């Protein structure tokens, strides 16, 4: 009958088997339970997508020891007014979420060990990305479709980080050939997954030549809907004897014949060329090249938070534990 | 005989057949007259020079009016075109034999490794002996087949030369099959391949002897009309 | 001990060469001497189309052995 | 078929919500949003700048793109 003797270990064991609403309800019992309701193990993984809630609340609930926070397509629409230690979290995704740049910088000022990162759709500034430059341990990066960032701070960010192996940077309207110049000049050449699609008259073949001559190991390359990558570009693709993903869809100047030279590379596994090869002759491509999946993977999964089965509440295999049904 | 060999090797871009390539597929521009070759099949070209502003197809060689309109549509070339084909054939196979002769060293190393591998695969040094002999006779066959071609160039065709060409073709086919065997099948049909290689290289050696005998007969009875 | 190349203005020019060069580098040399567009060019020697891959001695271009150049107008 | 609508727009950007039939509308994922080039690969056509920028849960197979000036 004596509750007053049950220890911290057993009470934490009980609280390890509760759902978020009741868990937050019972935090209001006494000071002891208040300490117990935040023990850097209950809050390991959290998911609060869709919401529009208080920036100080999310700052505290990130300070309490989350290693993987999943919250895309959400709002936190109020500025931040309290600053704490550099946040320990290592898996941050804000893909297509909506939030003001002030709250963005207030939260990203404490980025320390962000192993996997995604900030699709949001507006960022040069101080924001150069505070992101603190993280030299980032591996998966998805900064597609941002606005306001500049080339100088971009390339300083790339020089600062060193574990660049996933990079999804498609449809950032302010990318140019000088942007991809600084990109190749400052990324770690270990990179193997790169996305620079859609920039029809923003990129240039010579910068791709720089990318492939400094990066003979990249495997997953994406520059679709970029007509300004002429046929000699294929030659530089012919340089890469390591590629397995290659997306150059929507390139009118390309032909089904010259792209056959890419199939001359046995390492080429799948190809995403939707549009350049019309119906009928793609089967001839398949017959002439019998180990290539031409236009069979409609999307790339480079540093994407989730993919498949249309439920997939997990993120990169790190299943979140606490959510709201 | 060395007069014809000196003439053949004295080519310096052959001094004649380059002009046959000029007469093959080069035509001067109606604005900046210079050796110009159409490629492709578009038949709609603009003279892509630094100064030339004048567009024309290949086969007009004249007014730009037809293509884009309905004005005219193009209203010893062949007699020298075949000579290019024959010269390309003969010099091409000459160069093929030269190239496959220069790579004898790698051939020696490959067959020595193959012979050692077969020796540790339950057979004595006799395997190494007859593969070395096969390599030697193949090299000799190439080294004489080259010169049989260079002789088969500089002569006027008569009733006898068809036979000579047929014999060279058969010997060349045999040599190709032998090189194929040798570089293809060290891997376990060793007895059967020993049979095949032995028969093939004996036949090639005898056949080359026949060709040399025929050539010397032709020099003796004086039939070869250049 | 040089190689001569037929310039389109006549006047066969001379270069400096080693017997194991690369045809793309010879294209670079002739473009350096002229400025001609170095993708629409075919080299012709002894009546055979000199490709880009192998070396001079492979097609047997010795020293003081001329060649010729023709354009590859893409329309 | 692929039903477009008028240029109902926000203050600055411009929207035009589209409607897709069963076959080309039965592959839109509940997980995330498509890249503009991604739905181009899937074959939808419209003007330049139309990034797939949000999903509305009541209409899962009915897209609402975004475009700049």
């Amino acid at each position: 009958v004596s509750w007053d003797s049950l220890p911290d270990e057993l009470l934490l064991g009980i609280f390890s088997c509760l759902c978020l609403p009741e868990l937050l309800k019972v935090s209001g019992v006494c000071k002891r339970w208040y300490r117990l309701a935040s023990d850097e193990s209950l809050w390991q993984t959290l998911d609060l997508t869709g919401k529009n809630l208080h920036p100080d609340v999310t700052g505290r609930l990130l300070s309490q020891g989350v290693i993987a926070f999943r919250c895309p397509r959400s709002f936190m629409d109020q500025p931040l007014a309290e600053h704490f230690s550099p946040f320990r979290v290592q898996h941050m995704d804000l893909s297509n979420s909506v939030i003001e740049v002030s709250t963005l910088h207030g939260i990203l000022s404490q980025c320390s060990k962000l192993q996997n990162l995604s900030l699709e759709g949001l507006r960022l500034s040069d101080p924001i990305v150069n505070t992101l430059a603190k993280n030299s341990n980032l591996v998966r990066l998805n900064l597609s479709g941002c606005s306001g960032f500049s080339e100088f701070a971009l390339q300083t960010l790339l020089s600062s980080c060193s574990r660049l192996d996933e990079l999804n940077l498609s449809w950032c309207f302010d990318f140019t050939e000088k942007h991809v110049q600084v990109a190749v000049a400052h990324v770690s050449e270990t990179i193997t997954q790169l996305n620079l699609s859609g920039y029809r008259k923003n990129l240039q073949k010579s910068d791709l030549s720089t990318l492939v001559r400094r990066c003979p190991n990249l495997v997953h390359l994406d520059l679709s809907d970029s007509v300004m990558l002429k046929n000699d570009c294929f030659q530089e693709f012919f340089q890469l004897n390591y590629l397995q993903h290659l997306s150059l869809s929507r390139c009118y100047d390309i032909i089904p014949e010259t792209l056959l030279e890419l199939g001359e590379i046995p390492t080429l596994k799948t190809l995403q060329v939707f549009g350049i090869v019309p119906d009928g002759t793609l089967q001839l491509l398949k017959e002439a090249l019998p180990h290539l999946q031409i236009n069979c993977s409609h999307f790339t999964t480079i540093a994407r938070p989730t993919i498949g089965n249309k439920k997939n509440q997990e993120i990169w295999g790190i299943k979140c534990r606490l959510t709201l049904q | 005989k060395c007069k014809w060999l000196k003439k053949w090797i004295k080519k310096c871009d052959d001094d004649s057949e380059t002009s046959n390539w000029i007469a093959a597929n080069t035509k001067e521009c109606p604005k900046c007259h210079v050796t110009i070759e159409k490629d492709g099949g578009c038949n709609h070209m603009v003279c892509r020079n630094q100064n030339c502003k004048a567009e024309f197809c290949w086969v007009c060689l004249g007014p730009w009016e037809p293509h884009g309109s309905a004005w005219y549509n193009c209203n010893a070339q062949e007699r020298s075109r075949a000579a290019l084909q024959r010269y390309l054939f003969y010099c091409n196979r000459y160069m093929n034999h030269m190239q496959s002769l220069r790579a004898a060293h790698k051939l020696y190393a490959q067959v020595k490794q193959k012979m050692e591998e077969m020796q540790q695969h339950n057979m004595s040094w006799i395997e190494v002996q007859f593969l070395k002999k096969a390599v030697d006779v193949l090299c000799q066959c190439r080294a004489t087949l080259m010169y049989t071609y260079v002789f088969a160039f500089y002569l006027k065709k008569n009733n006898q030369s068809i036979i000579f060409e047929n014999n060279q073709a058969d010997l060349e086919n045999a040599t190709a099959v032998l090189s194929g065997y040798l570089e293809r099948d060290i891997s376990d049909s060793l007895q059967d391949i020993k049979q095949k290689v032995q028969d093939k290289y004996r036949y090639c050696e005898s056949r080359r002897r026949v060709l040399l005998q025929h050539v010397h007969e032709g020099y003796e009875k004086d039939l070869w009309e250049y | 001990m040089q190689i001569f190349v037929k310039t389109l203005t006549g006047k066969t020019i001379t270069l400096e060469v080693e017997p194991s060069d690369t045809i793309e580098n010879v294209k670079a040399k002739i473009q350096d001497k002229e400025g001609i567009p170095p993708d629409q060019q075919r080299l012709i020697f002894a009546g055979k189309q000199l490709e880009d891959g192998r070396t001079l001695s492979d097609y047997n271009i010795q020293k003081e052995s001329t060649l010729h150049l023709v354009l590859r107008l893409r329309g | 078929q692929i039903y477009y609508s008028d240029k109902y727009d926000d203050e600055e950007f411009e929207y035009r919500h589209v409607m897709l039939p069963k076959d080309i509308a039965k592959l839109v994922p509940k997980t995330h949003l498509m890249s503009e080039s991604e739905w181009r690969n899937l074959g939808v056509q419209q003007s330049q700048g139309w990034v797939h920028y949000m999903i509305h849960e009541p209409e899962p197979h009915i897209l609402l793109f975004r475009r700049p000036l």
Binding site: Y252 | - | - | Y4, R16, Q46, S47
Partner: peptide
């Protein structure tokens, strides 16, 4: 000797 026009189509 430009395709697959990515303009906004008809109603």
């Amino acid at each position: 000797s430009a395709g697959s026009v990515e303009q906004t189509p008809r109603r």
